[PDB]
Write a protein that binds this ligand. Sequence first.
Ligand SMILES: O=C1Cc2cc(Nc3cc(Cl)ncc3Cl)ccc2N1
Ligand SMILES: O=C1Cc2cc(Nc3cc(Cl)ncc3Cl)ccc2N1
Ligand SMILES: [Cl-]
Ligand SMILES: [Cl-]
Lengths: 4, 4, 122, 122
Amino acid sequence: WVIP
Amino acid sequence: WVIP
Amino acid sequence: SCIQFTRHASDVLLNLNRLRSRDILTDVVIVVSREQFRAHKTVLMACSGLFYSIFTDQLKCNLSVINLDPEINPEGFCILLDFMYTSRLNLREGNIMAVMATAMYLQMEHVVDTCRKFIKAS
Amino acid sequence: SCIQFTRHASDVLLNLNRLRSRDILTDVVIVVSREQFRAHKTVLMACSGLFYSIFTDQLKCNLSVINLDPEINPEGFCILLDFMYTSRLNLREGNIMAVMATAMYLQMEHVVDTCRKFIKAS
Ligand SMILES: O=C1Cc2cc(Nc3cc(Cl)ncc3Cl)ccc2N1
Ligand SMILES: O=C1Cc2cc(Nc3cc(Cl)ncc3Cl)ccc2N1
Ligand SMILES: [Cl-]
Ligand SMILES: [Cl-]
């Protein structure tokens, strides 16, 4: 999971 | 396009 | 010896979401309490262990309406349906409990994992 | 303020390809000369300008069989259908001309672009  |  | 187009999967999902927003080729309605959500059975199956089981069933595969358990929160479902079609999860303090419970019911293991991680941190 | 699961789109496409290999929820047959290819209309639309136009047509959207132009090569189509479901293109010296022609007909602009580049190099 990432910060888009 | 890449070499997978 | 194939070549690969890096953005292909993302572009396919973006186009499937555009079909969903325009209600094109949607073949099922998911009923969550009073709320109704139109979707593509294949996308639901690709994202959820629960929908995978439902639509591989020889009788349920032909249903145009699926009613979820009355404990399922419509907002939690909406957030998860958006994630299915975009890879983006709107996880917030006020919705995390309903999102985790809905993801556990829908059998969306990666969403359950991040919810457990975010709850543990707080 | 969403979070994003990097592998989600690829995982969705992988599961859609698994549904295709097992002939699950396929809703159309594409006929190319004597050869028949089963697929999901939504995936075809998401990948091809031609299928997008066909299945948004109020009459053609309801057809279970689509016949392609007799000039279309079944192998070129097979290579392109595999690419649609995997992001992987089996481009070879012996098939590049048939793949480019089929991609131009199917309106798959990124495949046309790489074929033009690979032909130019040789
Ligand atoms: O967390 C999850 C997500 C998920 C998706 C699917 N859907 C498929 C799985 C296979 Cl092997 N082939 C085809 C399909 Cl559509 C099943 C279980 C789960 N669990
Ligand atoms: O090279 C290409 C690939 C492609 C895909 C699609 N399919 C869509 C486009 C839009 Cl805007 N919304 C929904 C869909 Cl399914 C149309 C044209 C082309 N050209
Ligand atoms: Cl997930
Ligand atoms: Cl393309």
